[PDB]
A paper describes a structure:
Phosphoketolase (XPK) belongs to the transketolase family, a member of thiamine pyrophosphate (TPP)-dependent enzyme superfamily. It converts F6P, xylulose-5-phosphate (Xu5P) or sedoheptulose-7-phosphate (S7P), which are intermediates in RuBP regeneration, to produce acetyl phosphate (AcP) and C3, C4 or C5 sugar phosphates. XPK is an enzyme present in many microorganisms, primarily involved in substrate-level phosphorylation to produce AcP.
Given the importance of the physiological role of SeXPK, we solved the cryo-EM structures of SeXPK, both free (with coenzyme TPP/Mg2+ bound) and complexed with the non-hydrolyzable ATP analog, AMPPNP. In contrast to the published XPK structures from Lactococcus lactis and B. breve/longum, which exist as dimers in crystals, the cryo-EM structure of SeXPK is a dodecamer composed of six dimeric units, forming a circular donut-shaped array both for the AMPPNP-bound form and in the absence of AMPPNP. Using cryo-EM analysis, we discovered that these functions were enabled by a unique allosteric regulatory site involving two subunits jointly binding two ATP, which constantly suppresses the activity of SeXPK until the ATP level drops. Comparison between the free and bound dimers in the same orientation shows that the two subunits jointly bind two AMPPNP. The key residues, H706 and Y710 from reciprocal subunits (helix α24 based on Supplementary Fig. 3), sandwich AMPPNP in the dimer interface by forming π–π stacking interactions with the adenine ring of AMPPNP. The α- and β-phosphate groups of AMPPNP are stabilized by H706, H719, R721 and R753 and the γ-phosphate group by R711 from the reciprocal subunit. Of note, while the dimer–dimer interface in the SeXPK dodecamer involves residues near the C terminus, the B. longum XPK octamer involves residues near the N terminus. As the donut-shape or four-leaf clover shape-like particles or two-dimensional (2D) class average images were not in perfect symmetry, we further examined whether the assigned symmetries were pseudosymmetry. Some relative random motions were observed between different dimers in both SeXPK dodecamer and B. longum octamer assemblies, suggesting the likelihood of pseudosymmetry in these structures. The root-mean-square deviation between the structures with and without AMPPNP-bound is very small: (0.42 Å from 7,897 Cα atoms of the dodecamer and 0.36 Å from 1,256 Cα atoms of the dimer).
Numbering used by the authors:
A (entry chain C), B (entry chain D): 9 to 796
Amino acid sequence: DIATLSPNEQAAIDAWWRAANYLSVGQIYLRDNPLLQEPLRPEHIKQRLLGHWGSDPGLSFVYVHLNRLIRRLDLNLIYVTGPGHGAPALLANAWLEGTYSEVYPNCQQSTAGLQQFFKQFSFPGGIGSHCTPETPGSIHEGGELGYSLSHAFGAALDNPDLIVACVIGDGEAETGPLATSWHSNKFLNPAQDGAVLPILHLNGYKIANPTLLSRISHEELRSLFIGYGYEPFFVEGNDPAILHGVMASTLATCVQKIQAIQAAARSGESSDRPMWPMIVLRTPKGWTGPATIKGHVVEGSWRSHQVPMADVLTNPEHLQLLEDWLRSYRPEELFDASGAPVAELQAIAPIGDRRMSANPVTNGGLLRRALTLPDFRDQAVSVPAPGKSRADSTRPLGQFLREVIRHNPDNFRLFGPDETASNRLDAVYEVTSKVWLGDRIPEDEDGGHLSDRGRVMEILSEHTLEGWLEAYLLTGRHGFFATYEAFAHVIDSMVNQHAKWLDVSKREVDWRAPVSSLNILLSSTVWRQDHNGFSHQDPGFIDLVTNKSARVTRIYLPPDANCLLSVADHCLRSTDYINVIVADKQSHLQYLDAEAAARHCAKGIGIWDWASNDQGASPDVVIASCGDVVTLEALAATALLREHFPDLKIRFVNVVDLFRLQPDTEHPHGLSDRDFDSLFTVDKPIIFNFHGYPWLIHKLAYRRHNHNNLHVRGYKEVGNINTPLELAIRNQVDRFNLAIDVIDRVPHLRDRGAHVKEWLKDQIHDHIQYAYQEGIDRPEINQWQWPF
Amino acid sequence: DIATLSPNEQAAIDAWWRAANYLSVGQIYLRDNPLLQEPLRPEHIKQRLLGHWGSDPGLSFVYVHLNRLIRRLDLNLIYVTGPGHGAPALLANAWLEGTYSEVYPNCQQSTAGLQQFFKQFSFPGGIGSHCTPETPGSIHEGGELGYSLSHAFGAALDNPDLIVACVIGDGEAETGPLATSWHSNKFLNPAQDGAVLPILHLNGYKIANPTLLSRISHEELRSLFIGYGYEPFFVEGNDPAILHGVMASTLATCVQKIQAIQAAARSGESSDRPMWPMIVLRTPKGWTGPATIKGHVVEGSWRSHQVPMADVLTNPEHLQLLEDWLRSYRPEELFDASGAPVAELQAIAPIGDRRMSANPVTNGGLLRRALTLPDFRDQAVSVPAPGKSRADSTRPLGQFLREVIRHNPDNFRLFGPDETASNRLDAVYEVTSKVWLGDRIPEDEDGGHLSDRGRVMEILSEHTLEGWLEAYLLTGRHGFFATYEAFAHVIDSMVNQHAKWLDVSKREVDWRAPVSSLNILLSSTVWRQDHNGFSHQDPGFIDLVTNKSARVTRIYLPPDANCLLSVADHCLRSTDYINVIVADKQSHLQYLDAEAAARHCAKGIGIWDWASNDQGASPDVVIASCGDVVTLEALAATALLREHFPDLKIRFVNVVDLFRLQPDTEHPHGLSDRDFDSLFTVDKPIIFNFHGYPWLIHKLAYRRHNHNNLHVRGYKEVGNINTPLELAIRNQVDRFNLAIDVIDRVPHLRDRGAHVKEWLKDQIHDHIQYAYQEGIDRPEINQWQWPF
Ligand SMILES: Nc1ncnc2c1ncn2[C@@H]1O[C@H](COP(=O)(O)OP(=O)(O)NP(=O)(O)O)[C@@H](O)[C@H]1O
Ligand SMILES: Nc1ncnc2c1ncn2[C@@H]1O[C@H](COP(=O)(O)OP(=O)(O)NP(=O)(O)O)[C@@H](O)[C@H]1O
Ligand SMILES: Cc1ncc(C[n+]2csc(CCOP(=O)(O)OP(=O)(O)O)c2C)c(N)n1
Ligand SMILES: Cc1ncc(C[n+]2csc(CCOP(=O)(O)OP(=O)(O)O)c2C)c(N)n1
Ligand SMILES: [Mg+2]
Ligand SMILES: [Mg+2]
């Protein structure tokens, strides 16, 4: 009897459906007189109309039917909204269920509450027109389109009984990120994870153009969505009387198959990739609004996308049509005199946490358990002498991540775009593997590292991975993202969205608990250009992240492996941040042992006393580095200067936290003027060697008292192919150019260092000539060790 | 007989195939002794191996077969390479055809030429490992994956007889941009445009993971690629003896269907969307290389992706295997004593421009005709009084673009992501329409503006549009891209690729002629937030573009419609640039008439004399603006100051060319120190009101003599929903905050302007309170006109 729809139940569901639309339209238009007790007048209409209408009925249409199966089958559901402009529909149902009144006591279920509820939407000092963090039961802001689908899969991970109902607009489906995220079924495990129920809201139109997926034939539509691995179900029509029964049956069909798929997998009898059920819903745009306006068809057309009538404040004719639109919902039989929904509506409202707007998963910070972090000092490489030993920088991190996975079998995951092996993080493969539910071959047994139980997820689409991870954190869990720095620009749009979400959730919204940080590891830099990656890779992603704020993002550039461990350990505890860690996978020198590394990361920036020779004296120059390749060149330059200028006093400063450079006025995390003057003196030149565009340092530290003595060398440009030393020479960040820069800046070396400066230019000439002759650097360059 | 393959022809084709692989492997490994006349020794091997091997045989496999049909059917073809790391294969065939020797006389077809040809690849001072602009017959650098498919469609536009053979790697297909660009068949007109022949190189593996599209079943593969609208053809196997004949038949089948499709369409008998032929090629990775290395299978596995044996310089065992690998191609029977290919190879080499590496389309700048630009002064709005009249800013540009389309029916196009109507550029719809070959309905007749003959292209995927336009320019044609500024971050990766391509083509490569500029119009700004677009939209894309260089990118922020016309007219003539024009679609004031606008854009920056009152005197303050909304606030602030401080002298400067602010030392285009001191004085405060992040101005103009007096107000952050004046108040760019800033900075107003400053803060309080009360600004704010 679950598939069939009772006429009595059909009426109550239809009653809820209209009330949701009525509240949606009221939010768009009304600022006063919520229930049409008195004739509508221009003083009740909002001056500026920013809400969108063409998608609201469809979202409410599915939402009331989703609540039906929750009441019947006791399903645990989440609502993820593709078109974020359909916010009123979600809020209306949130208010109808009673969630919004509990979270916001001002917007009660009364006439006075409705007045505040209607006036707040898309209003200065109110709430936005998208699925902002202020929305109860919301994890995804659909303002930027293409990421709703991935967030459904991310939230589904390690939530076996959860089902995430994600509604997808046909216009959104034309975007690149969402077209590739359909293949996420191959990495979702039916045994341990939940289900995603994709609903294609094929209203037939974008803002102003038809959607191609609507204008592509039905046969090719089913062909496209079986090739994605889904079992597609089609509900088409325009008359709700038929469509209420038809779509209730389809949703009943889908849930049984989802449970049948999960039952088959968890029993172990069918350990294969299943054909997940997906719904294709073709309904008119602006479904229950005006039919035509000024002789142009509006409903079921792109003209209904935002607002069918935007001149209602101007001419009374449309104003009467607006009031006629509202009364078509028959609000007199939907709400009582007080302003609450009628008891028929309250009957079909789910109860407590079973409500999709009050599910604690959406407010994932309440479901967040801190990771049991093993002591990273067990994985710290031994550094008996600083800078005299070479070890692979990322392998200790791989071993540390292995022990985190061991102690957090479900709460933690790894995400990587087919680069985990290249990034040299294979230590995690010792305990787990990579997720794969596609076809398997015996050749995968040797080094494939493929299993459905794996805690590491791999796909070449960077958009898919970022959406997977962001949803995983917002549901109250932990993760780590590792990728090349060359392709970081691909996810720049997605990072902005998540940073937006975190910043609002901290300051504006008070009831949303903190979630875990977004930890990103840019594992291959632009200085050590390996085989893969384009020639002109740029560090520009770092500038984009620092563009957001110091109170939501953190940038770390640890110089060695122990410093990488402390940074990763520190950032696996921080909550409301986007942590971007820039480290290189090549074999590098090691500088700090576990104790010294931990103290260095706690400060974020500090003097290296072994690399300095200014103890108990005023340094003639401060050499600072931020990165690992540029740190090596800065250290090598320091060695060269000390050989040729024995009396020269050099203070070596290494900075790991980029944002420490900002003054404490901007953010509390930054250094004070006294602290900054202690590290970098008030009047001596600073030769800063930065892994990135040099102006980023100037943007951060422009207000310091010694900024006029700050001289930053960083990434400028590249050739087609360069050796590691030649590439540093092109950007003037190599050891020889840095030594020249120190000679130019130190006042008592311009006259005295002329002969050394000529010798340094000779070395640049010799190494370039050898580079063009052999294709690599000299052995003494590659095997350079810290002297002294 | 075209379908069947002669055994004599099969041998010569196989002879070409092995020689191409041999040259490819020689480029990867050898730096000396090209032909194995003497035993291989470590001094002949390259020190560092950066080339990739797993894709080279597949590219050469298709390439030799593509040349077959050129010789038979006289087809005009282009080779677009998906995996850019497969550069050696393209270069080897380029050398084999003789193109490379003609372009590069140093690399002759001899033994001495081969020594230079082998030693140059992936070498310092040589050439890169990707499809850089130095490659003959190359339009697309496949280093960043996901854009090869779109570039095929872009180059195909308005080239009816051209066929673009684009080879697509299975790993690349997992990326977001390429998954959505498959639907580009719906916008390609068989009647007027050429064909794209997509070849899916499904080698089964990525760098280190299996490709899901390979591990998805064959049935679901055909289902996926018929849903994209393609007729898929499958060639599978590993034995070339069978695969040579099978593949040749499939390519023969595809070309006939492509011609049959074009013949049916151009006769007019079948004006429907056709099922384009697409090839799915499943071959082992590292197809003709080592079978196993160190007990691990390499060929047909991810272990062959880059280099099967990377220790050949270390141990002689692999060194013998490398020489055994080379001799498996039997080079003795492929090259003569001199070093040229044998006459059998020369027989099957195409001739002249029919060679894909020597096709003049790829060097599109030779095929570039300058647009016949109508005088924009016909579309200039009348401005009898500056700043006293309001007109829609983008509509005159739409009319101007309409006349360009009229005079350039084939050489020009418009690209937009479902925003042309929103951007208010509908004037172009008066002469043309939008491309659409999907299903048509009678409802589209009213305002659909849909026709297959349209010169405007629409799709919600911004990745697809950018790839379409870049290829269109690189083939020697013109275009204009219009989109919102909110979603500009989506195409940031693609823009970097094209900027990279232009910069190399100007300085490094000498034989590549200039092509047309990339003209981008960010038509909706972040200050006038309309219905669509997320709340926290940022101008950060401007910072990303200025990141590249002043010698390849230009940023224009015209204040009014006449400045927009002059800027667009000026930028439709420039060749080797990425032109980004930031304009707003809202109804705005108009400031300059056609004559004054043209002079202003010629300077790029200049004093507005009507808005100034410092003529013949030293100005107390310089108020500068860069944008249109911020220009209005700067002008309104100027009016407020002149009302309350009649003696105050204000010079108003408007800047359209952002890069003029850079000193002439960086680039010739920038202003000199004398010119800059003329506009902005040497010692007076400058209140700069910028449409964007304020630091961008400081990055550009830090070297100026008066930079210490430069005070920039720009975009900082947003609330959820704000009125236009309230949003400007939040960022302190409104008229009242600017007037306060002038009071603070002018030395003789700190004491004297205290009472006005208190009044200004009262206005800020009053307008915010009104905004929270009504939801819009006061009528006098919305209808503000320039006084005086
Ligand atoms: N005040 C500044 N504001 C912003 N960027 C700056 C500033 N000063 C320098 N830069 C940037 O820093 C880089 C080099 O300048 P800088 O770090 O000062 O080293 P420098 O050797 O002193 N160069 P210069 O200041 O011109 O003598 C360039 O990319 C500049 O754009
Ligand atoms: N010398 C500088 N180098 C780089 N960025 C700068 C510099 N001075 C200011 N900025 C940037 O400019 C913006 C605001 O400063 P600014 O444009 O100078 O206005 P302001 O009122 O003068 N603030 P202040 O300089 O601290 O008194 C921020 O993005 C700063 O990072
Ligand atoms: C890549 C991109 N291009 C354009 C937009 C502008 N935009 C915001 S909402 C929207 C409508 C989405 O279309 P559709 O999925 O059909 O939604 P619905 O009909 O449910 O409103 C568009 C185009 C965007 N957000 N992203
Ligand atoms: C989005 C993205 N992720 C990762 C890479 C790194 N990368 C460069 S080339 C390459 C191989 C592409 O795989 P496939 O299409 O299978 O190519 P082929 O087997 O022909 O080498 C990869 C993963 C990239 N360029 N872009
Ligand atoms: Mg739609
Ligand atoms: Mg592959």
